[PDB]
Ligand binder design. Sequence first.
Ligand SMILES: O=c1[nH]c(-c2ccc(-c3nnn[nH]3)cc2)c(-c2ccc(F)cc2)cc1O
Ligand SMILES: [Mn+2]
Ligand SMILES: [Mn+2]
Ligand SMILES: [Mn+2]
Length: 200
Amino acid sequence: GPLGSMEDFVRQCFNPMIVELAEKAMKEYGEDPKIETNKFAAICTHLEVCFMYSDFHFIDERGESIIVESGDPNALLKHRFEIIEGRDRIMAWTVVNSICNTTGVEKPKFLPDLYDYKENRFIEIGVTRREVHIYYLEKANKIKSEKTHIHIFSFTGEEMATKADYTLDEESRARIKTRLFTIRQEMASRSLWDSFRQSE
Ligand SMILES: O=c1[nH]c(-c2ccc(-c3nnn[nH]3)cc2)c(-c2ccc(F)cc2)cc1O
Ligand SMILES: [Mn+2]
Ligand SMILES: [Mn+2]
Ligand SMILES: [Mn+2]
């Protein structure tokens, strides 16, 4: 088949909110999304996984964790997760500082991706084109000391999470894996996958 542009794929296969947040992040770190395109696609993918990870998860009227897939349910429900990824540095740290002071949890040395109000911990999300165990160690070794939970996804369906604690139900994580599989397949049909995979 013909080789598509990764740019076209990103703009066609991710919603504009994701794409825009991704562009802003790259600009913020001095990289151009029209040159570092594999990174661009990687950043969109990871951002989307972060959103999908928190999607539908609330804390109920009685204070336990429930799943609602409509927009019509109860406004007394609190989102289970705080989303840190996707915010600019100032706002991300503002949110982290707020959480840390409120909940009394320890302040992380690097920006995490999520905060989980049920488990009372920050989460580092990872999405890798390599084997999950290797990438996990790379994360584990950057965060140094840990209260921060790590959860790694691959494009081939493997997961690895701290202490074999996977946080979410199988259905939630299946949605994420299916999306990753779909991204991989679509890249492959445009002959973007091999280049993307080898670039990590
Ligand atoms: O696990 C993460 N990961 C990443 C991440 C994403 C892509 C690459 C990448 N892809 N190709 N070269 N570098 C590296 C780290 C990022 C990230 C997000 C926005 C941004 F502007 C820069 C980095 C954030 C994460 O939490
Ligand atoms: Mn970031
Ligand atoms: Mn992050
Ligand atoms: Mn991450």
